[PDB]
Amino acid sequence: ASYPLEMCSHFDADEIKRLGKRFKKLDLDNSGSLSVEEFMSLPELQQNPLVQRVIDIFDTDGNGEVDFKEFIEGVSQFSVKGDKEQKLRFAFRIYDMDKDGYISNGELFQVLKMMVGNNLKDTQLQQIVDKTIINADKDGDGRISFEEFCAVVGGLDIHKKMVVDV
């Protein structure tokens, strides 16, 4: 046998078993991790501009792929049993590209750039990014902490809209 996996998630044994079946069908080269190209081989993901961001967050050890533990812990963020702060912290991490716990002007710009494309000139995008940061930055370091981020979007209830059944 191998050693046990340690992990933290909202899932019971059966749910873990079910996600295990999905994981193995996805692992094309049956190697135990999940590469970016394995993720992209699902057609309905090739035109999703947040795919790489999501993988990046899932990939906690930073090694470029998603092993079984990170896959469980990542999907757990979206369990119906998960809380507001959890779903929010995840969305905060969509913006926090370098993972240092602050969203900086450049990161916010880049990640928006991924979604907006050419629907705004870079000048217009920069101006709204600037203003958003200024309005939300309560300690004057020029960036947005998790607490500042939440203060802005806590009331938006988008946490209610990011949930999946397993």
Binding site: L112, A136, K161
Partner: peptide, 17 residues
């Protein structure tokens, strides 16, 4: 602000994926 603006899109797209 861009959060209020983009957050719902983020929600849609990550959940969808």
């Amino acid at each position: 602000d861009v959060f209020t603006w983009s957050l719902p899109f983020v929600g849609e797209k990550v959940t969808e994926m």
